[PDB]
Amino acid sequence: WEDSFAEQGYKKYVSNYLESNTAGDPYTDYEKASGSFDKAIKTEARDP
Amino acid sequence: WEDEDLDTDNDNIPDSYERNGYTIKDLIAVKWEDSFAEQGYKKYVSNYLESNTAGDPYTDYEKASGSFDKAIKTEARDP
Amino acid sequence: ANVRYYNTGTAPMYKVTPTTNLVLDGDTLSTIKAQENQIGNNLSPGDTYPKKGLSPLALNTMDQFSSRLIPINYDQLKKLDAGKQIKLETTQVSGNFGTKNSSGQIVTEGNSWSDYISQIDSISASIILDTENESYERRVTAKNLQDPEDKTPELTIGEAIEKAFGATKKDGLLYFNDIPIDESCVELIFDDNTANKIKDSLKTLSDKKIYNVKLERGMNILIKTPTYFTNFDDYNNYPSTWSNVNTTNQDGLQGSANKLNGETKIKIPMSELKPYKRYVFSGYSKDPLTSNSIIVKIKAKEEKTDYLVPEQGYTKFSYEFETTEKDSSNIEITLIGSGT
Amino acid sequence: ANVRYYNTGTAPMYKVTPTTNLVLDGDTLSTIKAQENQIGNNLSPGDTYPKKGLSPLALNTMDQFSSRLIPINYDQLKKLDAGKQIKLETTQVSGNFGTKNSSGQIVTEGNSWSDYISQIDSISASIILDTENESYERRVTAKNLQ
Helix, strand or coil, rough: CHHHHCCCCCCCCCCCCCCCCCCCCCCCHHHCCCCEEEEECCCHCCCC | CCCCCCCCCCCCCCCCHHHHCEEEEECEEEEHHHHHCCCCCCEEECCCCCCCCCCCCCCHHHHHHHHHHHHCCCHHHCC | EEECCECCCCCCCCEEEEEEEECCCCCCCEEEEEECCCCCCCCCCCEECHHHHCCEEEEECCCCCCCCCCCCCCCHHHHHHCCCCCCEEEEEEEEEEEEECCCCCCCCCCCEHHHHHHHHCCCEEEEEECCCCCEEEEHHHHHHHCCCCCCCCCEEHHHHHHHHCECCCCHHCCEEECCCEEECCCCEEEEEHHHHHHHHCCCCCCCCCCHHHHHHCEEEEEECCCCCCCCCCCCCCCCCCCCCCCCCCCCCCCCCCCCEEEEEEEEEEEHCCCCCCEEEEEECCCCCEEEEECCCCCCCCCCEEECCCCCCCCCEEEEEECCCCCCCEEEEEEEEEEEC | CCECCCCCCCCCCCEEEEEEEEECCCCCHHHHHHHCCCCCCCCCCCCCCCCCCCCEHHHHHHHCCCCCEECCCCHHHHHCCCCCCEEEEEEEEEEECEEEECCCCCCCCEEEEEHHHHCCCCCEEEEECCCCEEEEEEEEECCCCC
């Protein structure tokens, strides 16, 4: 992450490096950051 | 090689994908030229980061080449 | 109740099981999900279950295994007895689709359509054509310009209607099996939100055509072909000949050259159209001096209105009349004026 | 009873099966788990079953194979006749969610939400917004310091 990506439209988010589901929901962190899980779930639920 | 690294396994080349387009020929996707319009070939493009660019359960290669079903109308053949 | 199904769209559906909803007057009597008797095995697109030559299909049961006929208590029986009728709605439909194996046999076992619905609807915009013999509804995807990582080829709406139905670029315009579809030769109907988006995104374009605006995420567009059309070079489908016409520079638009005065009158008998409906009569503008549009239709509003150009630019006008019931009467449209 | 559903949250839920509770005055007349008649196939977030333009959904039965209409004895009838009204509540809802295979087709068979509920609740804190047209409810995880 660099600070100059923000004008393009990219975000900044972090997670837990001892688990594969840091929020309990049945999608992993990589599967939820990159939107390759479902196209109906809202974009407010993309950061882990 | 330099310009054939398909990211998603849609079995179709990203240079033939984001550019002016592609067209199947003898069940193999090839580059698009403007003189193909006389014979009856179309021109369509798609999304090179997915394997289902419209959501429907047929992939891009499976829907361009009509090897999915013979009852679906040809209006739903471009992806 | 005797019902039959229909299907409009691109793909077929196997093992179709609709669920119906019966209402009478504010109430809701029952919700029926169709059993093994009223199931349907195939639906080729643009066809029905059963076919055109057969009687409809009866439903009278409500269990899983068909017993226990549908009841109605005494007040609802007296309401239904005293002239009224019940209304039937369709809520959802579950079915199947067909995937084939490695050049083997097509299987349909738990390949349900019902989990690809909320994914497709949140990507696509819906375009529905309505001619006078059939209808069509298609779904075309669209780009989301908020997410910069989101990649898909963006396309204009005049390209979306070009790609969805099978249309050909015949002399610049596009024609759907000897029917002209344009911006100025059809009737375009939106709901409120998409009309707001369209009128907000016209003022950034150089050309003020609405077929060059950008397709967006959640939209809804319906089009209707007219029933009678007055293209002058060719394609004027009319049993009644127009009166006091002119023929010079008459190919399309951008060539309006005839300034003439007087009146124009057309009369059509009722044997060529349907009664008890709400027609709409619409056209475009010019830079004349004055005109008026008298309708001489009985059982209706036989008044006129003024023409009143605000400018010389082409801005359309539209009015409406109301048809009689299959009488000897004739619709008589007269247009008086000085200037065109 | 004529009910309709709604959904406020993030992910959609397939094959909704709500169980309702009917009370009149201190009592509890019945607990109804919804059958295959009034089941709902899809529920996108911020929408309803049925949609915005259709009539509501009727429930009148209580078996698994739908027969045996719901009874009311004489005292509850005379209380309901004399002006009162009954109250409906929702206790729990079981449903499904959808995963896709190795670049293949989405499957929804036995992928139930009802075992990710008590894990997500013991991790998260709940934040609910209420404006004049809709509501929103979200769950955000938080750090333990013990």
